[PDB]
């Protein structure tokens, strides 16, 4: 007998000041966010949200970015009235990084906690400047980080689908999830765009002003060099997506930690096969 939340949250304040030059204390973030429950889980107390959102962060060795992410996003996600949880998918070992494979692990593991029907995939170093930019799913796949400071506050190209995005459970299943074989930097997000288009979908976006986003400046991570096979890979997505993705995924979870503000899943996703 709780009523549905309003369709758009009345709590939103719009544009927000965001800065990355001060230290962050997660103990204090946790105290500032008392309604956030163990594992980084929150649903509103006064109404039922139709947005059951698992937020998935691909991760290795970005603890500092992550504290900023948690400081800024948690208050935003509560104002958006989402029934949500945060998952940091931490790649075990020190071999070449695989962003999209971690994202698939996150989808599949989050489903074991709770009946999530919406998946937001967010890089760790991207912070939204306007809480009108909704971190939940739409009737088409949603590209969220549309106007990043590092690309001059617009799309670097109209088919860009990197950074932060949201797919419903059904959208994600319809494309057989994300590719597993993009090792090292680049192109897995273009492949994901291809997948959506080949399954009859198009990209929904907020406007450039609501969609403004900050990227935390940082230097190159080691073990995530540009993948030189990326350009060939993206040219063949239509054929490869049929049998690469959810239906070809394995991994071994090494450790699950419930911290107050996030669940961290440490996972062995292997090396190129
Ligand atoms: C698909 O190609 C277009 O973008 C590339 C630049 O490379 C992309 O840049 C974005 C933003 O950093 C990354 O998210 C993508 O993974 C990159 N994609 C690839 C394949 O590297 C540009 O050089 C091309 O001319 C196209 O605009
Ligand atoms: O060693 C790494 C490589 C990347 N990532 C994650 O993958 C995302 C994409 O990589 P990157 O930051 O290099 O993109 P860039 O900002 O350089 O274009 C990051 O935001 C992180 O979530 C990470 O955690 N550790
Ligand atoms: Mn980055």
């Amino acid at each position: 007998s709780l009523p549905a939340c309003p369709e758009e949250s009345p709590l939103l304040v719009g544009p927000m000041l965001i800065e990355f030059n001060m230290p962050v204390d997660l103990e204090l973030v946790a105290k500032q966010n008392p309604n956030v429950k163990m594992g980084g889980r929150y649903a509103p107390r006064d109404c039922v949200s139709p947005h059951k959102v698992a937020i998935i962060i691909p991760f290795r060795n970005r603890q500092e970015h992550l504290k900023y992410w948690l400081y800024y996003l948690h208050p935003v996600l509560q104002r958006q009235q989402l029934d949500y949880g945060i998952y940091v998918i931490n790649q075990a070992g020190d071999t070449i990084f695989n962003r999209a494979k971690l994202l698939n692990v996150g989808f599949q593991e989050a489903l074991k906690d709770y009946d999530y029907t919406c998946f937001v995939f967010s890089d760790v170093d991207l912070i939204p400047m306007n809480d009108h930019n909704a971190y939940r799913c739409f009737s088409q796949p949603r590209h969220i980080s549309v106007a990043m400071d590092k690309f001059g506050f617009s799309l670097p190209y109209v088919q860009y689908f990197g950074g932060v995005s949201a797919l419903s459970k059904q959208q994600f299943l319809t494309i057989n999830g994300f590719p597993n074989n993009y090792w090292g930097w680049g192109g897995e997000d273009d492949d994901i765009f291809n997948r959506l288009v080949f399954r009859g979908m198009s990209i929904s976006r907020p406007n450039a002003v609501v969609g403004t986003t900050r990227h935390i400046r940082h230097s190159r991570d080691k073990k995530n060099e540009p993948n030189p096979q990326r350009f060939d890979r993206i040219a063949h997505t239509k054929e490869t997506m049929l049998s690469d993705g959810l239906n070809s995924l394995t991994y071994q979870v090494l450790d699950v930690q419930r911290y107050p503000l996030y669940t961290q899943i440490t996972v062995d996703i292997g090396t190129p096969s």
Side-chain angles (χ1 to χ4, degrees):
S1 68
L2 281 176
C5 292
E7 151 147 23
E8 201 189 12
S9 170
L11 312 187
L12 304 176
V13 300
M16 287 174 316
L17 318 164
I18 305 313
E19 41 158 12
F20 306 119
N21 64 345
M22 81 293 189
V24 176
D25 173 12
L26 290 190
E27 251 179 340
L28 190 43
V29 181
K31 246 111 200 286
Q32 290 157 30
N33 285 281
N35 302 315
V36 170
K37 290 145 104 276
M38 188 59 66
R41 284 289 285 287
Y42 170 90
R45 122 174 33 213
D46 309 306
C47 58
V48 179
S49 178
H51 315 296
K52 299 196 269 142
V53 186
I55 290 94
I56 309 290
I57 309 182
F59 184 94
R60 178 176 57 205
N61 194 207
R62 289 296 196 87
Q63 197 61 21
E64 193 184 89
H65 293 176
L66 173 63
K67 297 145 84 191
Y68 287 117
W69 193 96
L70 295 170
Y71 175 59
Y72 287 109
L73 268 303
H74 264 302
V76 170
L77 304 165
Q78 299 166 77
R79 294 201 293 285
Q80 299 185 359
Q81 304 193 304
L82 307 179
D83 176 359
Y84 73 88
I86 308 304
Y87 296 80
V88 173
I89 311 307
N90 170 44
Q91 178 167 327
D94 295 279
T95 55
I96 183 171
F97 199 74
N98 194 335
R99 171 186 188 264
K101 192 177 178 180
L102 300 169
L103 298 188
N104 282 346
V105 168
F107 168 89
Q108 198 160 275
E109 295 292 308
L111 283 171
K112 293 166 185 176
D113 282 355
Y114 186 64
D115 183 30
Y116 294 107
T117 51
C118 173
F119 295 81
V120 168
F121 307 90
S122 177
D123 291 352
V124 76
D125 48 25
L126 294 178
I127 313 277
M129 311 189 61
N130 192 315
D131 61 24
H132 277 288
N133 188 358
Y135 267 54
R136 45 79 165 188
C137 292
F138 291 72
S139 64
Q140 288 295 320
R142 181 77 163 187
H143 188 220
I144 294 171
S145 59
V146 304
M148 287 167 41
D149 58 6
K150 81 156 159 166
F151 300 127
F153 312 92
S154 57
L155 286 164
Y157 45 109
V158 294
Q159 302 179 348
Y160 173 69
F161 191 67
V164 185
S165 77
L167 282 85
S168 65
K169 180 175 178 181
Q170 197 52 61
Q171 290 154 4
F172 187 92
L173 288 177
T174 295
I175 60 176
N176 182 37
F178 298 158
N180 292 317
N181 55 174
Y182 285 78
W183 298 94
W185 184 92
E188 81 300 340
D189 47 331
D190 295 319
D191 180 283
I192 300 167
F193 173 94
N194 293 348
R195 291 179 178 232
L196 297 165
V197 157
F198 299 137
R199 291 284 177 283
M201 287 168 273
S202 62
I203 307 307
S204 179
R205 283 190 177 110
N207 73 57
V209 172
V210 172
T212 289
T213 302
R214 286 223 44 201
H215 175 256
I216 308 167
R217 304 182 59 158
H218 60 75
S219 43
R220 259 111 48 129
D221 306 284
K222 297 175 299 198
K223 304 305 190 203
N224 194 49
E225 309 292 322
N227 176 10
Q229 322 178 323
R230 70 193 186 281
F231 308 104
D232 274 313
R233 281 192 204 266
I234 72 184
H236 295 101
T237 301
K238 190 188 220 168
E239 314 110 81
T240 62
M241 72 190 278
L242 290 164
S243 60
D244 193 303
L246 276 197
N247 70 359
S248 67
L249 168 73
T250 71
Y251 51 90
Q252 182 55 223
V253 171
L254 302 191
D255 185 40
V256 180
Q257 296 284 348
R258 310 283 165 177
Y259 293 113
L261 304 162
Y262 64 104
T263 293
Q264 177 165 290
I265 292 172
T266 300
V267 60
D268 185 345
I269 53 133
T271 49
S273 89

PDB file of all heavy atoms in Angstrom, residues 50-62:
ATOM      1  N   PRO A  50       9.423   2.520  -9.664  1.00  0.00           N
ATOM      2  CA  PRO A  50       9.400   1.500 -10.714  1.00  0.00           C
ATOM      3  C   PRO A  50      10.833   1.263 -11.253  1.00  0.00           C
ATOM      4  O   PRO A  50      11.046   0.321 -12.029  1.00  0.00           O
ATOM      5  CB  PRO A  50       8.502   2.128 -11.796  1.00  0.00           C
ATOM      6  CG  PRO A  50       8.720   3.628 -11.599  1.00  0.00           C
ATOM      7  CD  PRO A  50       9.156   3.866 -10.190  1.00  0.00           C
ATOM      8  N   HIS A  51      11.807   2.044 -10.779  1.00  0.00           N
ATOM      9  CA  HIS A  51      13.183   1.882 -11.239  1.00  0.00           C
ATOM     10  C   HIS A  51      14.020   1.048 -10.293  1.00  0.00           C
ATOM     11  O   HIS A  51      14.459   1.536  -9.237  1.00  0.00           O
ATOM     12  CB  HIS A  51      13.843   3.238 -11.506  1.00  0.00           C
ATOM     13  CG  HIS A  51      12.966   4.168 -12.272  1.00  0.00           C
ATOM     14  ND1 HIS A  51      12.570   3.910 -13.562  1.00  0.00           N
ATOM     15  CD2 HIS A  51      12.371   5.338 -11.916  1.00  0.00           C
ATOM     16  CE1 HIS A  51      11.772   4.880 -13.977  1.00  0.00           C
ATOM     17  NE2 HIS A  51      11.654   5.774 -13.005  1.00  0.00           N
ATOM     18  N   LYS A  52      14.250  -0.205 -10.687  1.00  0.00           N
ATOM     19  CA  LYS A  52      14.997  -1.162  -9.865  1.00  0.00           C
ATOM     20  C   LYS A  52      16.298  -1.320 -10.582  1.00  0.00           C
ATOM     21  O   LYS A  52      16.423  -2.047 -11.589  1.00  0.00           O
ATOM     22  CB  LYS A  52      14.249  -2.488  -9.772  1.00  0.00           C
ATOM     23  CG  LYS A  52      12.849  -2.311  -9.096  1.00  0.00           C
ATOM     24  CD  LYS A  52      12.231  -3.681  -8.635  1.00  0.00           C
ATOM     25  CE  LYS A  52      11.359  -4.293  -9.752  1.00  0.00           C
ATOM     26  NZ  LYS A  52      11.438  -5.821  -9.907  1.00  0.00           N
ATOM     27  N   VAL A  53      17.254  -0.566 -10.078  1.00  0.00           N
ATOM     28  CA  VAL A  53      18.415  -0.213 -10.835  1.00  0.00           C
ATOM     29  C   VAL A  53      19.662  -0.784 -10.186  1.00  0.00           C
ATOM     30  O   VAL A  53      19.963  -0.450  -9.044  1.00  0.00           O
ATOM     31  CB  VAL A  53      18.570   1.325 -10.960  1.00  0.00           C
ATOM     32  CG1 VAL A  53      19.733   1.638 -11.899  1.00  0.00           C
ATOM     33  CG2 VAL A  53      17.314   1.956 -11.487  1.00  0.00           C
ATOM     34  N   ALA A  54      20.421  -1.597 -10.919  1.00  0.00           N
ATOM     35  CA  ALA A  54      21.703  -1.964 -10.429  1.00  0.00           C
ATOM     36  C   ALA A  54      22.727  -1.106 -11.135  1.00  0.00           C
ATOM     37  O   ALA A  54      22.746  -1.067 -12.369  1.00  0.00           O
ATOM     38  CB  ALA A  54      21.963  -3.499 -10.693  1.00  0.00           C
ATOM     39  N   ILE A  55      23.601  -0.435 -10.386  1.00  0.00           N
ATOM     40  CA  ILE A  55      24.620   0.413 -10.983  1.00  0.00           C
ATOM     41  C   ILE A  55      25.972  -0.319 -10.978  1.00  0.00           C
ATOM     42  O   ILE A  55      26.487  -0.697  -9.917  1.00  0.00           O
ATOM     43  CB  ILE A  55      24.759   1.819 -10.270  1.00  0.00           C
ATOM     44  CG1 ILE A  55      23.542   2.717 -10.529  1.00  0.00           C
ATOM     45  CG2 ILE A  55      25.868   2.674 -10.961  1.00  0.00           C
ATOM     46  CD1 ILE A  55      22.477   2.682  -9.508  1.00  0.00           C
ATOM     47  N   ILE A  56      26.587  -0.428 -12.149  1.00  0.00           N
ATOM     48  CA  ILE A  56      27.709  -1.315 -12.359  1.00  0.00           C
ATOM     49  C   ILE A  56      28.929  -0.538 -12.774  1.00  0.00           C
ATOM     50  O   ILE A  56      28.906   0.170 -13.775  1.00  0.00           O
ATOM     51  CB  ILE A  56      27.360  -2.317 -13.492  1.00  0.00           C
ATOM     52  CG1 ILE A  56      26.003  -2.998 -13.225  1.00  0.00           C
ATOM     53  CG2 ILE A  56      28.435  -3.321 -13.680  1.00  0.00           C
ATOM     54  CD1 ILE A  56      26.025  -3.928 -12.106  1.00  0.00           C
ATOM     55  N   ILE A  57      30.001  -0.660 -11.989  1.00  0.00           N
ATOM     56  CA  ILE A  57      31.209   0.102 -12.236  1.00  0.00           C
ATOM     57  C   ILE A  57      32.400  -0.819 -12.559  1.00  0.00           C
ATOM     58  O   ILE A  57      32.798  -1.624 -11.741  1.00  0.00           O
ATOM     59  CB  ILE A  57      31.578   0.982 -11.024  1.00  0.00           C
ATOM     60  CG1 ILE A  57      30.399   1.836 -10.556  1.00  0.00           C
ATOM     61  CG2 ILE A  57      32.777   1.839 -11.336  1.00  0.00           C
ATOM     62  CD1 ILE A  57      30.797   2.764  -9.345  1.00  0.00           C
ATOM     63  N   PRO A  58      32.971  -0.715 -13.752  1.00  0.00           N
ATOM     64  CA  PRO A  58      34.134  -1.577 -13.971  1.00  0.00           C
ATOM     65  C   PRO A  58      35.317  -0.930 -13.291  1.00  0.00           C
ATOM     66  O   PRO A  58      35.455   0.277 -13.369  1.00  0.00           O
ATOM     67  CB  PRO A  58      34.360  -1.500 -15.485  1.00  0.00           C
ATOM     68  CG  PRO A  58      33.889  -0.061 -15.841  1.00  0.00           C
ATOM     69  CD  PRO A  58      32.770   0.267 -14.831  1.00  0.00           C
ATOM     70  N   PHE A  59      36.187  -1.715 -12.674  1.00  0.00           N
ATOM     71  CA  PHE A  59      37.104  -1.190 -11.665  1.00  0.00           C
ATOM     72  C   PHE A  59      38.392  -1.982 -11.573  1.00  0.00           C
ATOM     73  O   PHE A  59      38.364  -3.206 -11.571  1.00  0.00           O
ATOM     74  CB  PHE A  59      36.407  -1.242 -10.304  1.00  0.00           C
ATOM     75  CG  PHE A  59      37.209  -0.638  -9.191  1.00  0.00           C
ATOM     76  CD1 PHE A  59      37.013   0.703  -8.822  1.00  0.00           C
ATOM     77  CD2 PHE A  59      38.157  -1.401  -8.499  1.00  0.00           C
ATOM     78  CE1 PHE A  59      37.754   1.278  -7.776  1.00  0.00           C
ATOM     79  CE2 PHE A  59      38.905  -0.838  -7.449  1.00  0.00           C
ATOM     80  CZ  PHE A  59      38.702   0.504  -7.087  1.00  0.00           C
ATOM     81  N   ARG A  60      39.524  -1.288 -11.509  1.00  0.00           N
ATOM     82  CA  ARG A  60      40.726  -1.847 -10.892  1.00  0.00           C
ATOM     83  C   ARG A  60      41.612  -0.658 -10.518  1.00  0.00           C
ATOM     84  O   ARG A  60      41.914   0.172 -11.379  1.00  0.00           O
ATOM     85  CB  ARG A  60      41.499  -2.817 -11.812  1.00  0.00           C
ATOM     86  CG  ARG A  60      42.804  -3.353 -11.150  1.00  0.00           C
ATOM     87  CD  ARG A  60      43.592  -4.410 -11.956  1.00  0.00           C
ATOM     88  NE  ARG A  60      43.969  -3.928 -13.294  1.00  0.00           N
ATOM     89  CZ  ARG A  60      44.214  -4.725 -14.333  1.00  0.00           C
ATOM     90  NH1 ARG A  60      44.174  -6.053 -14.199  1.00  0.00           N
ATOM     91  NH2 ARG A  60      44.507  -4.199 -15.516  1.00  0.00           N
ATOM     92  N   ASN A  61      41.994  -0.549  -9.238  1.00  0.00           N
ATOM     93  CA  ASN A  61      43.025   0.435  -8.832  1.00  0.00           C
ATOM     94  C   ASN A  61      42.616   1.885  -9.142  1.00  0.00           C
ATOM     95  O   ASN A  61      43.350   2.637  -9.779  1.00  0.00           O
ATOM     96  CB  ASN A  61      44.373   0.112  -9.522  1.00  0.00           C
ATOM     97  CG  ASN A  61      45.556   0.868  -8.885  1.00  0.00           C
ATOM     98  OD1 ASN A  61      46.563   1.147  -9.546  1.00  0.00           O
ATOM     99  ND2 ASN A  61      45.420   1.217  -7.590  1.00  0.00           N
ATOM    100  N   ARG A  62      41.415   2.252  -8.730  1.00  0.00           N
ATOM    101  CA  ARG A  62      40.899   3.606  -8.902  1.00  0.00           C
ATOM    102  C   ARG A  62      40.163   3.920  -7.622  1.00  0.00           C
ATOM    103  O   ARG A  62      39.030   4.424  -7.675  1.00  0.00           O
ATOM    104  CB  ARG A  62      39.858   3.646 -10.045  1.00  0.00           C
ATOM    105  CG  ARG A  62      40.419   3.471 -11.439  1.00  0.00           C
ATOM    106  CD  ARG A  62      41.369   4.606 -11.883  1.00  0.00           C
ATOM    107  NE  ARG A  62      41.571   4.603 -13.330  1.00  0.00           N
ATOM    108  CZ  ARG A  62      40.782   5.218 -14.212  1.00  0.00           C
ATOM    109  NH1 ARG A  62      39.729   5.940 -13.850  1.00  0.00           N
ATOM    110  NH2 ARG A  62      41.075   5.125 -15.490  1.00  0.00           N
TER     111      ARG A  62
END
